[PDB]
Amino acid sequence: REIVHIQAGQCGNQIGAKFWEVISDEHGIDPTGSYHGDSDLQLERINVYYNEATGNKYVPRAILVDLEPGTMDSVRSGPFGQIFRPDNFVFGQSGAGNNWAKGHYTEGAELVDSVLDVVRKESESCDCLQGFQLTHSLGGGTGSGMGTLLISKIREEYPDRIMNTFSVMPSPKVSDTVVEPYNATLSVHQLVENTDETYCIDNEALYDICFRTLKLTTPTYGDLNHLVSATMSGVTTCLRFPGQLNADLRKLAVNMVPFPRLHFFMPGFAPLTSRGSQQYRALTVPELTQQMFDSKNMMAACDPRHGRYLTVAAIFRGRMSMKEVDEQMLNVQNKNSSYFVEWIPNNVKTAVCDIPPRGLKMSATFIGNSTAIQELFKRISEQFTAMFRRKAFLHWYTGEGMDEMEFTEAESNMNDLVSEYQQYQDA
Amino acid sequence: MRECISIHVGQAGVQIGNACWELYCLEHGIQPDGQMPSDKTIGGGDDSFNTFFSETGAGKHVPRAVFVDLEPTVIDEVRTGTYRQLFHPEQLITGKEDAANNYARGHYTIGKEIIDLVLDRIRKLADQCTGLQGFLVFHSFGGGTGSGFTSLLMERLSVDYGKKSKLEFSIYPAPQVSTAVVEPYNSILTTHTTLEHSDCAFMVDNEAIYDICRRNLDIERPTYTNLNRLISQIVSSITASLRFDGALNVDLTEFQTNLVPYPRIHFPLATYAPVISAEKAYHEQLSVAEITNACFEPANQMVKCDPRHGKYMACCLLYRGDVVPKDVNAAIATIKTKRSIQFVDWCPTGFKVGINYQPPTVVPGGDLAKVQRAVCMLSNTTAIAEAWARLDHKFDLMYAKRAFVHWYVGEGMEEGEFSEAREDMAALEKDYEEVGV
Amino acid sequence: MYTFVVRDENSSVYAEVSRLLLATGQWKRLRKDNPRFNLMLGERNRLPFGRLGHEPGLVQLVNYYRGADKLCRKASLVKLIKTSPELSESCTWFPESYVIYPTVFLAAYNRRREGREGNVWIALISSEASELLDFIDEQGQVHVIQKYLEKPLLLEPGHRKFDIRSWVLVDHLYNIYLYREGVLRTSSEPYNSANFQDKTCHLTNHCIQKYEEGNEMFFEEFNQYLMDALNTTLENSILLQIKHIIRSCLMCIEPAISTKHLHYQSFQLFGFDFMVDEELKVWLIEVNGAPACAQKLYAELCQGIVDVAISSVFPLATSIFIKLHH
Amino acid sequence: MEVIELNKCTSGQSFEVILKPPSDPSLEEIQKKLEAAEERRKYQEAELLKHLAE
């Protein structure tokens, strides 16, 4: 059950690279591709993400995409930069200028076919391809515009594989340009149609977690991406290690997505750790359970008490009592059962995996399909219309051939998605 | 002698089948390589264990089994496990991509591609049968394969073996070990499409097995391995009469005759006693009276429900061990007074009793203690409809919003098959309710 | 913090019980259709006993005993008293009764033509069999016909009939708790055995009455009257027999309804309706499975349900009941 | 309480105790249904491809 990973633009390749660092350390693969681990749980599911090369080396099934060479030379220089298959660096030279239209229609279209060539060569070496995971942001031009172009073309070539994304939402608190709300709205329009599962990673929440909880007065993308790679490691635990469940991307979609358009997940993580400084008291199972449901541990800046949980996945990591985990999970439901829709029975499912993440004895990853996520889309929608009602900054997009109409369509699809979430929060 | 073919489908079915065939081999003295020093008729025989085992000219005793899963993980453990010797590779059928907990993916999309192969392997064992009785089909209600591929297999088996009996052992979904939020959907869909193709079905609710393991085996968080070794004990009580000399439930036809007077209502409750922890050092051995009385305690049933508030249509007692008729009638005498046991007016108030002197066999190193006498009760009581009501309520909750329906429609199923399957369930609950008031 | 749902809005007793629970700060009420409850204050008809006790991580408790209707149905109580060896065909405390349907009663009424003894019965009251049998067929449903107690004990001053309502609570352990406050529900009309069709002094039901307030005389007054008028006590002359009848009925059905080894648990409040004849003999009329309480006693009794049936199972941070020892 | 049909052998015995007397579709249809389902999948998928072509 091979997964093909794609990472696109500056943000997508920065969090992409951290992901492969983190899980590589977990599977005991070193920066040259050689395995130097102790357990065999490490290698039982290694092929979900790694291709095996002659010499018994492990090479990520990862395609690195950008319209600029900058960040990708950074990856290739980074610690684990040499583990990536070099044919899988597909990049242009012009960049995308934080402009969704350039990534999706002009610059990106020039490059997309050679990206699809690498994707095809990766797929054809797969016994049973599950599908794809894309890391990208929605606020720039490459990961946003070209990333959603790739998804639209991958779905045309592989209509029956699962399409999974980690999508970083823009925020004025960690903002590169004023046009981020435009790019994000155009992208959400694509995501609603063409993905099965998207983890909404809100730069607004990562910032607030760094500032309030981690006591970092000046968060950097480094501080944010530490949180992102711990979440990405947590949510993919079930794919990468064996459980009582034989977990894959489609079973996840089947159990998490009751209506096709409502596939935007709130991730959460516990304990929240800042980079570098470790703390030496492992959490207790009661503490993991309480924090991972705490709004302060959510990676989408949405208040879960303002919505209802359609479904929930919880993945505990470490040596712990499965009896006590079952007990604490049953306790949080039965105590706050009003926040779980009553018309999906037993909509909370929990897994435990023996291997903890690096530097923690106990961790818990939360994946929520909450109607509270509409708060994120409302936020971006308000920022969009503030500019769009004055046509501000549109010339950057009409200059690439786009029409106002296409903005009106994307905004209106995103507002329907908001209304569709409110439908089921009252149900 | 008349042969039986066991078919195990999906994860739950395959893993339970492994537990059972392990147990059968210990009970008949067949080693992991299939050699059976006890069979002096080498390469042959019409002995009653040949009902489940064929023999090679080399004297190997091979299960009359086919395992089928839509993904390779589980049957691959059989292919390399301790009993890898037993089975012929042709008996272990695997796909590449499973049903994804989706009834319509197992029945329609994937099912359609493998149903001819499986029935071709099933036909190969039937051709080694001098007089085939029919099939025992093991599967979950909850899986995409268990529910969806089994119901397609059960239709074709009716077509191909019109004259043969089909029995089910069905794992009913429990949230404490459940795999999917849509198991109520799959359960109702597979019941509706399978009902008229199955002559008799023993439902095991994973909730009940799970709580017996916690209460009586003192296992904090039971694993499938704990559940299946207990389940396989119950299956073994139920199949012992097909594999041993005796006069009760001697062919699959007799299960219908003895337990199912009305054909739709073919779901007998199984109750088993005693379940004794193997770590319990000092265990006072339970009497015939005590283990029989325990057959009327809901805490020992394969499905929790209250038979006091239903009616019986039939009841069998299956004992293994030091048991003689006189103790059974004495135990039955005083339980008739002390218990609420109502039969339907058009049925005699009585018990068919079967005693096999070989006491229960327990897997060495497992969780069950060896005991001197055990009993499995099979009772067709309308109180098992409580389980239909629970499932149907959960189905109604989700389906009123049409939650998750798009996953099934996207596999080519029509929304209307949902309300068709539900309406059949509605008629099923109404049948039980007529008989039971 | 325990949880409970309410599924019988028409219940005065449990309208109180839920308000008491909420006001302890340790109970929260859910929506009627939420399955993660500890306690179900359930509906009267078709209560879903088959969906209870399948919530992992939830001790579940309900305020009804499945199977208890066989005691609280006029026709079912008859069949249970005539066919259970524990309650002989002759109970000596149940009035003679038969279940006639409308599409062996005549064998007994004829016996009364032998001695021309009393021959008033009830459903509704009459004196000739035909007058009544035409009434059960005019209604269409199953009625039960019963020997009318032609010589009831009459309270003076007034020459008035009455019945006694006793409230009995049966907890999850099958303890039988008899509330110590009974009520007499008296007829303001002076009894007379000539005109039955004027059933204001015969039917002693509070509604049918649309000396003492509310036509209700509590045990304090009635015991005082028995002392002054008859030289005995309420305990000796009537309450011994009542406790015997309550214990006998509930001990009879205990194997059929007990939830001791069951995956959910029941308690239930019963109202037992009695009738004291002129020799200070106590008779059982009916058993009401969903009884209301007298206004003065709502506070005390609903609090005592919480103490004994609910908090007994779900504890928080001298007594008003007599335990009937079986 | 009446005991009947006592059968004995070396493995055990069986019998019955009375406490009280009383008071399909064809292969070709399967094939239609499956093939109808596969056509509905093909319709849905061609609609997706038509939309992606737009």
Ligand SMILES: Nc1nc2c(ncn2[C@@H]2O[C@H](COP(=O)(O)OP(=O)(O)OP(=O)(O)O)[C@@H](O)[C@H]2O)c(=O)[nH]1
């Ligand atoms: N008692 C018992 N139940 C099992 C076992 N394995 C799975 N189950 C039950 O089966 C249900 C799901 O059906 P499965 O059989 O596991 O799924 P499947 O048959 O492989 O079908 P797929 O969806 O294709 O995987 C779960 O809810 C489990 O409760 C087992 O080994 N023993």
Ligand SMILES: Nc1ncnc2c1ncn2[C@@H]1O[C@H](COP(=O)(O)OP(=O)(O)CP(=O)(O)O)[C@@H](O)[C@H]1O
């Ligand atoms: N055998 C008998 N002899 C004399 N009086 C009798 C009697 N049976 C009943 N009665 C009286 O006549 C009344 C007839 O009403 P019935 O017993 O049908 O009402 P009920 O008890 O069902 C009303 P509720 O449910 O509100 O208590 C009784 O309440 C009692 O006062």
Ligand SMILES: Cc1ccc(-c2[nH]nc3c2[C@@H](c2ccccc2)N(c2ccc(O)cc2)C3=O)cc1
């Ligand atoms: C309410 C609910 C939620 C999920 C499931 C279910 N069923 N099968 C699978 C799931 C998820 C899952 C969720 C939590 C624990 C274990 C599995 N999952 C998975 C796959 C890939 C991942 O990266 C992470 C998780 C599966 O593979 C059933 C009900």
Ligand SMILES: Nc1nc2c(ncn2[C@@H]2O[C@H](COP(=O)(O)OP(=O)(O)O)[C@@H](O)[C@H]2O)c(=O)[nH]1
């Ligand atoms: N969390 C996080 N967000 C980032 C990072 N880099 C960029 N972003 C976000 O992505 C947006 C810019 O889009 P970007 O991906 O850099 O443009 P691209 O090169 O065309 O893909 C900004 O709003 C940032 O908030 C990063 O390393 N971490």
Ligand SMILES: [Ca+2]
């Ligand atoms: Ca032989």
Ligand SMILES: [Mg+2]
């Ligand atoms: Mg940038």
Ligand SMILES: [Mg+2]
């Ligand atoms: Mg499987």
